[PDB]
Every structure is written in C-alpha cells, then in structure tokens.
Amino acid sequence: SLVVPNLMGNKDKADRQKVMSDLVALESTLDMYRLDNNRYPTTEQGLRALVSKPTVQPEPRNYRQDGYIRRLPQDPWGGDYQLLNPGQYSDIDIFSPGPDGVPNTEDDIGNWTL
Ligand SMILES: [Ca+2]
Ligand code: NA
C-alpha cells in the first residue's frame, strides 16, 4: 500500500538510457576510425574527427573519404558530447555534459559508467 515516488527518477533513467545509447554508438564509430587509422582522435581533433578529416596533426593516414558517421548526436539536453584522449578510465573518456550543460561537472554522464 506504499508506492515509492519515482517521477523524476524515471525521467533520469530514460535520459541516461539515451545518453548510453549515444555513447555506445560513438564508441563503435571511434573503433572503426581506429581500425583504419591506428589511433583514436586527439582531444583537439575530437568527436568531430569522425564526421570529416581533422585539420590538425596527427593527420589520420587512412581516413575514409566519407568519414565514419553522418552526424554527431546531441545529448537529451541539447548539449555536445565530449572526448578526452587519453581517458582516465578507458582509452578515451566520452561524455555528455548532463543537465547543467557544462563539461567536467558532477552532472556529466560518461562512458566510464557503462
Ligand atoms: Ca556537466
Ligand atoms: Na560523410
């Protein structure tokens, strides 16, 4: 006879699920980039490197003319996914900035929680 409140918790789980789905897709795309080019994008090159060839070194040596992804997704709050090379927890840390929209805050939802 006691229903635990879950309105926002349920919203949070749905939002986290979209973020994780985006992160998984990005990781797969980053792996295709690495299979071709033998490294992941640098922090400067970023996730944008998956769309078209970066304009800074290290220049990928086997970059598909079509790139690795058609478009970069945004997170559920309209924010941009972030990339750090080298990662603290993985080869590459990839994360949504979360609700607050600021990279590297407590709000970040990252691939280290996959
Ligand atoms: Ca944040
Ligand atoms: Na393309």
- DSSP letters spanning 13-59: HHHHHHHHHHHHHHHHHHHHHHHHHSSPPPTTTTGGGGTS--SSSSP
Give the distance (Å) from ligand 1 centre to CA of residue 105: 4
Closest CA to 68 of 89, 53, 78: 53
Q: Which ligand is nearest to the CA of 95?
A: 1
What's the CATH number for 1-112?
3.30.700.10
Closest CA to 82 of 90, 93, 71: 93
What separation in angstroms does the CA of 68 have from each of 1, 26, 28?
52, 10, 10
Query: What's the resolution in A?
Result: 1.8
Task: Please state the domain extents for the chain.
Answer: 1-112
CA–CA gap between residue 105 and residue 72 (Å, rounded): 22
Q: Which ligand is nearest to the CA of 72?
A: 2
Cβ atoms of 41 and 83 within 8 Å: the answer is: yes
Give the distance (Å) from ligand 1 centre to CA of residue 109: 8
Q: Of all helices (H) and strands (E), which one includes residue 7?
A: helix 7-37
Q: Which ligand is nearest to the CA of 68?
A: 2
